Amino acid sequence: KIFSMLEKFGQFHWFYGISIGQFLSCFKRVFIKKRVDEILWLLYQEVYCQFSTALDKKFKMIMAMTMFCLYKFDIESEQYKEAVLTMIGVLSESSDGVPKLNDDLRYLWDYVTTKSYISALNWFKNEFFVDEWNIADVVANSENNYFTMASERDVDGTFKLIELAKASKESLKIIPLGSIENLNYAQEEISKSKIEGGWILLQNIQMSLSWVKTYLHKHVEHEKFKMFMTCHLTGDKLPAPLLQRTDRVVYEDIPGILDTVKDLWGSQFFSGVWSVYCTFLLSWFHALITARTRLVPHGFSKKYYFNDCDFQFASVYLENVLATNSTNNIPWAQVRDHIATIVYGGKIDEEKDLEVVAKLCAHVFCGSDNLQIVPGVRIPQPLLQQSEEEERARLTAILSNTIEPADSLSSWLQLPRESILDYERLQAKEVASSTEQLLQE
Amino acid sequence: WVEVQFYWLDLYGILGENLDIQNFLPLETSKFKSLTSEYTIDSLKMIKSSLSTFLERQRRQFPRFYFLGNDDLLKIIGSGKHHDQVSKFMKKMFGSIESIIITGVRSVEGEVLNLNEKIELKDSIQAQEWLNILDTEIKLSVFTQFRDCLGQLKDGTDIEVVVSKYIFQAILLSAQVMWTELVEKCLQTNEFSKYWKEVDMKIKGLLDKLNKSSDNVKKKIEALLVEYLHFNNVIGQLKNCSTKEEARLLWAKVQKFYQKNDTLDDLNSVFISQSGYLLQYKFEYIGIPERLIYTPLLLVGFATLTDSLHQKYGGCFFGPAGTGKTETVKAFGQNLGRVVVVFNCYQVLSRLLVGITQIGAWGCFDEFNRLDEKVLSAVSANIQQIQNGLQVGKSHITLLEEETPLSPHTAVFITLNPGELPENLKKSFREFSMKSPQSGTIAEMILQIMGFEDSKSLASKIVHFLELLSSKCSSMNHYHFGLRTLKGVLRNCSPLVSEFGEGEKTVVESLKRVILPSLGDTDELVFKDELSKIFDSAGTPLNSKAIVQCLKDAGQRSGFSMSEEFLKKCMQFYYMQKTQQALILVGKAGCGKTATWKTVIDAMAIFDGHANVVYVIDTKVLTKESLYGSMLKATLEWRDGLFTSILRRVNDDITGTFKNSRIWVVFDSDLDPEYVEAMNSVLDDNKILTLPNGERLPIPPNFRILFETDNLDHTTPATITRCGLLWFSTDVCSISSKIDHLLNKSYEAELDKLKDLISDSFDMASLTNIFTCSNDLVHILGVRTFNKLETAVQLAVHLISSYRQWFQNLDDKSLKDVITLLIKRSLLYALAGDSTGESQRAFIQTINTYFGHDSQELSDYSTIVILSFSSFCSEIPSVSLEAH
Numbered sequence A: 001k002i003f004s005m006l007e008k009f010g011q012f013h014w015f016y017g018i019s020i021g022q023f024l025s026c027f028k029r030v031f032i033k034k035r036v037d038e039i040l041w042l043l044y045q046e047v048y049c050q051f052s053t054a055l056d057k058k059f060k061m062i063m064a065m066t067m068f069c070l071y072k073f074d075i076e077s078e079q080y081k082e083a084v085l086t087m088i089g090v091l092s093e094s095s096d097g098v099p100k101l102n103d104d105l106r107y108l109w110d111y112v113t114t115k116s117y118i119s120a121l122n123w124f125k126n127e128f129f130v131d132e133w134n135i136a137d138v139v140a141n142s143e144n145n146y147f148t149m150a151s152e153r154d155v156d157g158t159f160k161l162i163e164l165a166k167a168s169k170e171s172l173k174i175i176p177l178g179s180i181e182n183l184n185y186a187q188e189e190i191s192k193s194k195i196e197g198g199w200i201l202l203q204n205i206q207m208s209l210s211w212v213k214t215y216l217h218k219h220v221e222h223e224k225f226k227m228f229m230t231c232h233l234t235g236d237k238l239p240a241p242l243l244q245r246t247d248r249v250v251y252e253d254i255p256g257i258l259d260t261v262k263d264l265w266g267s268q269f270f271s272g273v274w275s276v277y278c279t280f281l282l283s284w285f286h287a288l289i290t291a292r293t294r295l296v297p298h299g300f301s302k303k304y305y306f307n308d309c310d311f312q313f314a315s316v317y318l319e320n321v322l323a324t325n326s327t328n329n330i331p332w333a334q335v336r337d338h339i340a341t342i343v344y345g346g347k348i349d350e351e352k353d354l355e356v357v358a359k360l361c362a363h364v365f366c367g368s369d370n371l372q373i374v375p376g377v378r379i380p381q382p383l384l385q386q387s388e389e390e391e392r393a394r395l396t397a398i399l400s401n402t403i404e405p406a407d408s409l410s411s412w413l414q415l416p417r418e419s420i421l422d423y424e425r426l427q428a429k430e431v432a433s434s435t436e437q438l439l440q441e
Numbered sequence B: 001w002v003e004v005q006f007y008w009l010d011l012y013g014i015l016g017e018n019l020d021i022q023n024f025l026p027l028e029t030s031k032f033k034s035l036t037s038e039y040t041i042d043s044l045k046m047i048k049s050s051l052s053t054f055l056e057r058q059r060r061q062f063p064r065f066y067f068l069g070n071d072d073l074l075k076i077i078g079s080g081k082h083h084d085q086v087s088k089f090m091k092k093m094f095g096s097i098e099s100i101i102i103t104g105v106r107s108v109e110g111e112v113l114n115l116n117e118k119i120e121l122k123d124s125i126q127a128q129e130w131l132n133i134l135d136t137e138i139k140l141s142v143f144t145q146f147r148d149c150l151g152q153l154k155d156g157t158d159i160e161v162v163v164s165k166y167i168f169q170a171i172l173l174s175a176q177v178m179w180t181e182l183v184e185k186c187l188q189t190n191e192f193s194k195y196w197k198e199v200d201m202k203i204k205g206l207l208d209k210l211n212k213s214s215d216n217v218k219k220k221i222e223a224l225l226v227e228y229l230h231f232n233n234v235i236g237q238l239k240n241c242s243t244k245e246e247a248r249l250l251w252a253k254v255q256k257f258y259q260k261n262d263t264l265d266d267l268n269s270v271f272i273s274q275s276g277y278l279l280q281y282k283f284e285y286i287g288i289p290e291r292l293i294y295t296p297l298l299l300v301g302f303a304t305l306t307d308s309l310h311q312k313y314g315g316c317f318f319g320p321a322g323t324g325k326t327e328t329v330k331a332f333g334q335n336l337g338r339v340v341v342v343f344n345c346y347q348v349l350s351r352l353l354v355g356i357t358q359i360g361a362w363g364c365f366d367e368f369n370r371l372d373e374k375v376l377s378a379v380s381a382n383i384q385q386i387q388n389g390l391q392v393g394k395s396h397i398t399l400l401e402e403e404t405p406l407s408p409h410t411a412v413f414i415t416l417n418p419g420e421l422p423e424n425l426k427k428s429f430r431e432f433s434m435k436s437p438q439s440g441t442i443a444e445m446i447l448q449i450m451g452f453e454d455s456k457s458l459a460s461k462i463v464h465f466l467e468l469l470s471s472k473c474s475s476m477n478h479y480h481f482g483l484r485t486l487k488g489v490l491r492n493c494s495p496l497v498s499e500f501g502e503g504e505k506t507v508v509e510s511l512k513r514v515i516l517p518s519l520g521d522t523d524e525l526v527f528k529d530e531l532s533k534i535f536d537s538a539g540t541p542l543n544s545k546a547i548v549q550c551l552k553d554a555g556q557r558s559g560f561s562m563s564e565e566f567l568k569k570c571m572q573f574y575y576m577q578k579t580q581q582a583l584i585l586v587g588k589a590g591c592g593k594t595a596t597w598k599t600v601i602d603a604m605a606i607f608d609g610h611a612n613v614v615y616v617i618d619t620k621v622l623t624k625e626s627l628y629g630s631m632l633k634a635t636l637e638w639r640d641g642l643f644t645s646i647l648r649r650v651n652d653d654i655t656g657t658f659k660n661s662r663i664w665v666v667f668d669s670d671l672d673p674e675y676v677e678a679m680n681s682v683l684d685d686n687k688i689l690t691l692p693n694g695e696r697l698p699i700p701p702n703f704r705i706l707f708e709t710d711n712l713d714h715t716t717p718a719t720i721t722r723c724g725l726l727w728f729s730t731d732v733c734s735i736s737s738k739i740d741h742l743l744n745k746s747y748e749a750e751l752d753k754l755k756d757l758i759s760d761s762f763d764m765a766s767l768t769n770i771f772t773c774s775n776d777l778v779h780i781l782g783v784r785t786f787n788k789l790e791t792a793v794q795l796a797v798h799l800i801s802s803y804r805q806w807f808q809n810l811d812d813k814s815l816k817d818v819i820t821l822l823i824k825r826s827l828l829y830a831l832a833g834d835s836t837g838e839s840q841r842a843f844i845q846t847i848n849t850y851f852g853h854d855s856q857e858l859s860d861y862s863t864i865v866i867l868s869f870s871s872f873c874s875e876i877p878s879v880s881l882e883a884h
């Protein structure tokens, strides 16, 4: 039954294709780690802890809930079967009625009544699947040497692999592509690391999929050698023989906003006080728009992808504006228009997204006497007797002391709570419908 | 032998004649000398492949010669003494110069340029040296025209005398410069009315000069008035600004032109400012090309292109077709005084790309999504390499595995039509999505430049009318209501103003003449209702009695019927061939197309007294090689195709008849894009024919091209919009009209009494009943009865003609019965002759019950023997077949 469910997952998307030798090796790991009920529980726990990290968050929740449902359907009675079925139905708003009356089931009904859909979905992992796996646990408990780390856009695993290499004290080599010189350098580095070992990083190989078809099929036990390649979940299809011979890892984008601001401002290494203040505001706005990007049903209407390139171009534009102004009168309207209708609206092909981006620009680049960028904290205007280092210290201090609230997706992005609750309800409906399609078939 | 001799003479003129060029390939030149002394084709081809490195060095000597292939370039090199074959192919060099006048050069559209000084010519001068000298000379001529125009304008001289002497480019950018300076001087104070009035009287005086000018002066003046309307609009907007912040923002958004007053250089002395962003003017001659009407969204596109190109990253457009991306790119490029090459969608593409990156010009890609995976990947990799080399500031780039120099001003532009580019391109490109351009502003400014007294209101009305047409009419394949159709309508308004005058009537009449032929029937009624409801003019009928009388005379001469639908189609074809050159006639099968244009030919031959020559040609019957030509690769021999032979014979004009006659070449077959893209150069306003050998055969103005087709599923909208499209919604006749025309035709192919009896016997009362009864009958290979009337007539009248030898010895009743029986048999074997036997007997019963019981009832096996009415039972001959 578990293998049938995983075959369905592999049929849903081209990245989830699960082999059979992997399943048998996971079953071997069940006994390796340290009566029939205990063996079955260890089977379920080990299979989830091995095959969760090869899926995205939505399919993670789907597989967790389906595994809990199958275990409770086989172990518990018919009343709990009907209760679980009707809770899954009311999650998708298909079956209406209270479950038959269990402390944990009462907690589920309390969470459903309070419309906390993400907590209801994560309750299964909170209750049954106690153990969790990160990227380090996957790479440490893997016998292979070739790894694929795919993810969505608006995020990258370069810093995560940097942290992993620092943790393992291994010299990593990030190899960007784009030129035949880059391809030759990557080939030479591969031919070197196939002898002397070492961790080698490959990034955004979907554009070089043709080079993959040319070289990797013909190419594919050294110590401290693990080849990493990064793909995109929305990209082109990778070859199946390449995918079956490697371990698959999916990374999740961070949910915070202040962390993004800190990460952006920690790389803007320097133009005096005004340039630094402009770069600070630009980092805040890039973080806010990147946070609003993922909210596809309500905040936006289409999943755009604002990388750091448009932030860099906006920084260049602000530098050029600040250079040609000796009167200390910043043209707020000009920079607002250029950000709204060229920089962060050039790729936009819809009117409503342009209007909301312009509204956010007016909210951020107003240049008021005392701006309230978020309801939590207010950034005062700089004074007229400061150098660059004093302003940098002041901005870092005013960045550190801020508190990220639990409603950052509503208060900081200026959205009604009903929209976010509707988005979460739609996600719950999708998860429940998918797990029903897994159940009845 | 001939090919070897020609190649030997060409290579001798290339390498043997000139000295000190054989050092790069000494062994190859020695082999060439040995084969020349011996005189082979294979050795010559191998040498010319080995001479590509020498050819590459030759193209590196003057990079502007790279734009041609091997054959054209070797033709250029061989004719290095007579100073010929170079000026003829000058169009492919710069795109805005057609020929060389050394006194000067002449533009593609027809503008002459005068050099600052003459350049000495000798028979021992290689092409590259004087080509580069001519390029420097024309650039310096543009610079000195800039400086003397600035001196004259700052002196106080009016624009009307400057515009009549210098080039449009110089006066245009001088007016831009002085407009920037005086708007700045107005910005240092709070006064804007005086410069607004000054540019207003400047526009009015330029219009007064325009209305009595020649063709080139009219084009140049319009190309100046578009920017002067821009200046008027900008100053009017700046005057309307409440605060100085809005004025500063609007002035930073729009383009500004500045000239450095301290740099000793000339080409690096004029820069363009927009929101603090600097771009370098190139000062390349462009002539008087098409100037886009300026809109605020055009300025936004200009601003985002400038913002992208400041950081050494090219621009990239994407959006629905018809929003004006490629024309926006072209206007931006020629606004900087440089020519942007245009790619229409691998070896030739990569060669053009490496030539672009080694010349430093701009590359524009149109409709990027029609490439295969391999060529798309290779082109994306090449563009990524070029752009990374530009970003890294590399003097040379490793593009296509050759070391070629990289200019810092090279840019690549790509347009897309989504409903995509790879990851590497989008990592190094900026995307812009323009909306629907304001057709109100374009229409208003083109109407103001055409002198319409009511411009804004009429433009709003016409764009609202086009929106209503697009939102109400059917969703046919060939229906285009974008900006192309509006621009074509307002262009075709130009010849109509001499008879209808400026105002609503000319716009309504041109709207009819352009839109109405291309619509169906319910679409035509919707168009008429919307035109009556929105526009005030009711469309009074003009005085055209002579032409309709001539059409009626030609129709009665050829036996045709003058039904009002046929008159409407004839008038549409005549008014559409008055202006448009290449016409397309579309309708159902056998709906009266060839008859229509033949009637038009006869009628206006009568009307004008002008001779007509017709060359009927089927498109699909002849192959591509036989239609135009076939370069015989065995000996590089040229065999002229039928159309090209006709064009050469009409260009030669040995008899001199074609100087006083009209020549039509119809194309009576289904349209093939492979057969129409080969003559796209004839299609547009260029009116020139390209050939595989490179000849540019001109087309006389009376040399018309026609197309006849039954469908438009396999025809591109590009040729549809450029052609005048005539649509036959229904048949142009009645059944009685066609039956009478066929009877008259076969009569031409007691005789008067017989003709009267035949014409009276085809009484429409029972004929319509039996025709609508047979229309409900199942016919194999189902064709309309309108296509069976021909069979019916040609069978019946031939039977009567063959039986005419026994028509003087029988009674009137017997003759009537014989005629009726023959007619019944003919209509049986024409209408229901393609149906089953039971249905044939049913149609026999229907004929008998619908022609009356008094008439002779035709039996299922009846016949006439030599005369009496017999049955087919008696004519069966018994056969005695043998054993084996």
Ligand SMILES: Nc1ncnc2c1ncn2[C@@H]1O[C@H](COP(=O)(O)OP(=O)(O)OP(=O)(O)O)[C@@H](O)[C@H]1O
Pocket (backbone or CB within 6 Å): B559, B560, B561, B562, B566, B588, B589, B590, B591, B592, B593, B594, B595, B596, B668, B708, B710, B732, B733, B737, B738, B741, B742, B790
């Ligand atoms: N008044 C008329 N106007 C037009 N056609 C007529 C008229 N009277 C008769 N005809 C018929 O039109 C025929 C001429 O061909 P027609 O123009 O109808 O075909 P077509 O549409 O050009 O054909 P194709 O589709 O094969 O190219 C004549 O043979 C005749 O039978």
Ligand SMILES: Nc1ncnc2c1ncn2[C@@H]1O[C@H](COP(=O)(O)OP(=O)(O)O)[C@@H](O)[C@H]1O
Pocket (backbone or CB within 6 Å): B291, B292, B293, B294, B295, B298, B320, B321, B322, B323, B324, B325, B326, B327, B328, B366, B367, B415, B437, B442, B482, B483, B484, B485, B487
């Ligand atoms: N400012 C302008 N002036 C004149 N025509 C314009 C302007 N902007 C857009 N157009 C129109 O854009 C249309 C062509 O652009 P488009 O169809 O996008 O090119 P492509 O088909 O190569 O994508 C033409 O109808 C042209 O009239």
